[PDB]
Amino acid sequence: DEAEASKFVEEYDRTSQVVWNEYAGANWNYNTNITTETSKILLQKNMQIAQHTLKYGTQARKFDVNQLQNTTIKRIIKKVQDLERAALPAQELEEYNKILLDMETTYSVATVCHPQGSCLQLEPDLTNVMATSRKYEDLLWAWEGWRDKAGRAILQFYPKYVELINQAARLNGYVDAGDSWRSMYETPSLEQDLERLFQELQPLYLNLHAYVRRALHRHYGAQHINLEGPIPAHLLGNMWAQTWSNIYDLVVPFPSAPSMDTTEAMLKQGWTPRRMFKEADDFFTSLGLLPVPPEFWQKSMLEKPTDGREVVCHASAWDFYNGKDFRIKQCTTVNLEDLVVAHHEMGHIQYFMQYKDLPVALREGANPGFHEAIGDVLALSVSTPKHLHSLNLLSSSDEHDINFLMKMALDKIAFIPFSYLVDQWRWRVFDGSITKENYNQEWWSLRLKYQGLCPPVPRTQGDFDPGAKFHIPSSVPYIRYFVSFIIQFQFHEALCQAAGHTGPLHKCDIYQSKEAGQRLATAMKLGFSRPWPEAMQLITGQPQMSASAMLSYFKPLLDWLRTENELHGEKLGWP
Numbered sequence: 001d002e003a004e005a006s007k008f009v010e011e012y013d014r015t016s017q018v019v020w021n022e023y024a025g026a027n028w029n030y031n032t033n034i035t036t037e038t039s040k041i042l043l044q045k046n047m048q049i050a051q052h053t054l055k056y057g058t059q060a061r062k063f064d065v066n067q068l069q070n071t072t073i074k075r076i077i078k079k080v081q082d083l084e085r086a087a088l089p090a091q092e093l094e095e096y097n098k099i100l101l102d103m104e105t106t107y108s109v110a111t112v113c114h115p116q117g118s119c120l121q122l123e124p125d126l127t128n129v130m131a132t133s134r135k136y137e138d139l140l141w142a143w144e145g146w147r148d149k150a151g152r153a154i155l156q157f158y159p160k161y162v163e164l165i166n167q168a169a170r171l172n173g174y175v176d177a178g179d180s181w182r183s184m185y186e187t188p189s190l191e192q193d194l195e196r197l198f199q200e201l202q203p204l205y206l207n208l209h210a211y212v213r214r215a216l217h218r219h220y221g222a223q224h225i226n227l228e229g230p231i232p233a234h235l236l237g238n239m240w241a242q243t244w245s246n247i248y249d250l251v252v253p254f255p256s257a258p259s260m261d262t263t264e265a266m267l268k269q270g271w272t273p274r275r276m277f278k279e280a281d282d283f284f285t286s287l288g289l290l291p292v293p294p295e296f297w298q299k300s301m302l303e304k305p306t307d308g309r310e311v312v313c314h315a316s317a318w319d320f321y322n323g324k325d326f327r328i329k330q331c332t333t334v335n336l337e338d339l340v341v342a343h344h345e346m347g348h349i350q351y352f353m354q355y356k357d358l359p360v361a362l363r364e365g366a367n368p369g370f371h372e373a374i375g376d377v378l379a380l381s382v383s384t385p386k387h388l389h390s391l392n393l394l395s396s397s398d399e400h401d402i403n404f405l406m407k408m409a410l411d412k413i414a415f416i417p418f419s420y421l422v423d424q425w426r427w428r429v430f431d432g433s434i435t436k437e438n439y440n441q442e443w444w445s446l447r448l449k450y451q452g453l454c455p456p457v458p459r460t461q462g463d464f465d466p467g468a469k470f471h472i473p474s475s476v477p478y479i480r481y482f483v484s485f486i487i488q489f490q491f492h493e494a495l496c497q498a499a500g501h502t503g504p505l506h507k508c509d510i511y512q513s514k515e516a517g518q519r520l521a522t523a524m525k526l527g528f529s530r531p532w533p534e535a536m537q538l539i540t541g542q543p544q545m546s547a548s549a550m551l552s553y554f555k556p557l558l559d560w561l562r563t564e565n566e567l568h569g570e571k572l573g574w575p
């Protein structure tokens with residue numbers, strides 16, 4: 001009995017390595033070269049992996065995991081019993097694969113055109129408009145045009161996708177796809193736990209929101225900003241208003257303090273995408289963590305091809321399940337925002353390398369939020385003024401300190417409500433609370449409730465603004481990012497303590513700390529082998545998610561914001 005189970009998991013492991021490697025290859029070849037041909041081969045590797053999954057999954061279900069002694073084998077088998085989409089009947093599976101492809105392709109190739117003028121892609125053209133334009137109408141053109149072309153085009157697919165992903169979930173024992181996604185945390189209290197964390201971050205977010213609102217009122221005019229209302233969603237420097245640091249220049253706390261736009265210095269000093277990834281590689285090895293293999297530099301796609309290929313630009317990190325081949329696919333622009341993204345992606349690679357010797361079933365983060373957090377933790381240290389000066393991107397006070405904390409808050413704090421709301425919407429869609437008649441309206445009620453944003457153009461029939469955000473057509477869960485943004489501060493706090501930092505958490509730089517590296521490595525090596533609180537304990541010395549570290553980091557800014565907002569009589573929040 002125990003021996004039949006051990007044999008099954010050995011067979012699953014050897015066979016999955018091969019099939020998954022093949023699938024990954026075909027997926028890569030489509031994502032880096034969208035053609036009718038690579039599309040065909042991919043829809044076919046889809047059948048190969050589904051047949052494997054069905055064969056092994058059917059077998060795994062014949063085991064009574066109740067009767068199994070060995071906890072590693074019990075866990076693998078329990079996981080393999082979940083077939084995901086391979087539980088679907090053939091016709092439904094083919095239909096589902098095709099909608100997924102059609103949605104991701106639609107998003108990745110959408111353009112927004114001036115009439116008898118040029119057509120702009122999201123990366124880089126529209127991204128650059130939203131980051132740099134300070135003209136209401138130009139921002140509006142890009143914000144609305146993107147939703148009209150990408151969002152509206154996804155709407156035709158999305159009800160059918162919901163039906164099929166929910167069907168698959170039920171066939172694997174869940175009540176709907178959102179139940180199956182939440183299950184990845186193995187935490188029955190997840191919903192409650194996440195709300196509590198979100199509530200802890202409200203003082204900070206509301207004070208940041210009010211401060212930024214006031215600054216936007218100063219630039220865009222009184223007739224366009226209601227000081228007691230939501231902020232128009234196209235003014236925050238980002239297509240989704242999910243991060244706000246591109247409007248730092250409008251909101252600087254101490255504009256008299258000498259400053260140097262990082263992005264401008266990178267370009268002035270001839271940085272390239274390769275240099276950006278090498279810098280990240282260097283931070284990892286400085287910690288005693290693993291270097292990316294030679295193969296990574298040969299095979300990765302670190303900038304947008306200029307050779308006529310059409311690609312999925314949206315940055316991602318890829319494991320080919322052979323313990324040797326790891327790659328990033330990103331349409332990298334030379335700027336600080338993408339340096340942070342590069343670190344993020346390099347964290348995923350780091351995780352893949354750390355757990356490469358586990359059985360493939362356990363080759364995941366402790367929970368999905370841990371996978372997202374690793375690269376972000378190193379990027380916190382990278383972003384410090386001291387570290388950017390060491391890279392020759394900054395030439396150099398309480399003034400500079402508050403300025404820095406505001407720059408950081410515009411990314412990290414502004415993202416909290418956005419990252420919370422995405423799957424609050426999708427969970428309700430999947431559980432049937434939001435129908436296709438109310439997709440958009442319910443999105444905007446959440447955008448208002450959590451972020452305090454309004455749409456600058458009233459939405460109409462046929463809009464499907466969630467479709468204009470990559471993870472929606474791509475079927476990538478989002479709550480991981482909310483988790484990540486909380487826990488990355490816990491990890492920074494712990495690692496700073498392990499490295500012997502004293503003084504304010506925000507002045508920590510863990511560059512070259514082997515003590516910090518070792519903490520991270522022990523945790524990453526666990527993969528998915530143990531309940532996530534064990535990885536949390538290895539890093540932090542305690543088992544809980546907690547907002548305390550993020551609050552600690554930002555406390556000097558909280559104080560500064562409260563004093564500033566009070567001085568101007570701001571009314572926090574909106575109706």
Ligand SMILES: *[C@@H]1O[C@H](CO[C@@H]2O[C@@H](C)[C@@H](O)[C@@H](O)[C@@H]2O)[C@@H](O[C@@H]2O[C@H](CO)[C@@H](O[C@@H]3O[C@H](CO)[C@@H](O)[C@H](O[C@H]4O[C@H](CO)[C@@H](O)[C@H](O)[C@@H]4O)[C@@H]3O)[C@H](O)[C@H]2NC(C)=O)[C@H](O)[C@H]1NC(C)=O
Nearest residue numbers: 005006007008009010069070071072073357358359362529
């Ligand atoms: C429950 O089952 C798990 C899984 O077992 C593994 O998979 C099964 C399907 C089957 O094929 C098993 O035969 C197979 O082991 C057991 O967990 C594994 O436990 C062993 C320990 O017996 C671990 O082995 C380690 O492997 C390292 C890398 O190859 C190796 O370097 C380690 O040794 C190090 O320590 C020695 C001490 O002598 C020292 O010389 C060095 O410091 C050296 O490097 C060590 O042998 C596996 O890694 C575990 N595998 C996984 C995937 O977790 C588990 O023990 C079992 N539970 C019970 C109660 O028996």
Ligand SMILES: C[C@H](N[C@@H](CCc1ccccc1)C(=O)O)C(=O)N1[C@H](C(=O)O)C[C@@H]2CCC[C@@H]21
Nearest residue numbers: 314315316317340341344345348372474476481
């Ligand atoms: C750029 C990044 N791309 C995602 C791709 C995820 C993915 C997953 C599965 C298949 C295809 C793509 C990731 O690396 O987690 C991303 O979407 N985000 C999120 C986002 O931009 O929405 C916020 C996260 C912090 C830094 C960058 C991270």
Ligand SMILES: *[C@@H]1O[C@H](CO)[C@@H](O)[C@H](O)[C@H]1NC(C)=O
Nearest residue numbers: 033034035036037038307309
């Ligand atoms: C893109 O795919 C086409 C069709 O499969 C193939 O012939 C071509 O060589 C590919 N281009 C690159 C750069 O790989």
Ligand SMILES: [Cl-]
Nearest residue numbers: 240465466468
């Ligand atoms: Cl939107």
Ligand SMILES: [Cl-]
Nearest residue numbers: 368477479480
């Ligand atoms: Cl997730």
Ligand SMILES: [Zn+2]
Nearest residue numbers: 344348371372
């Ligand atoms: Zn990620």
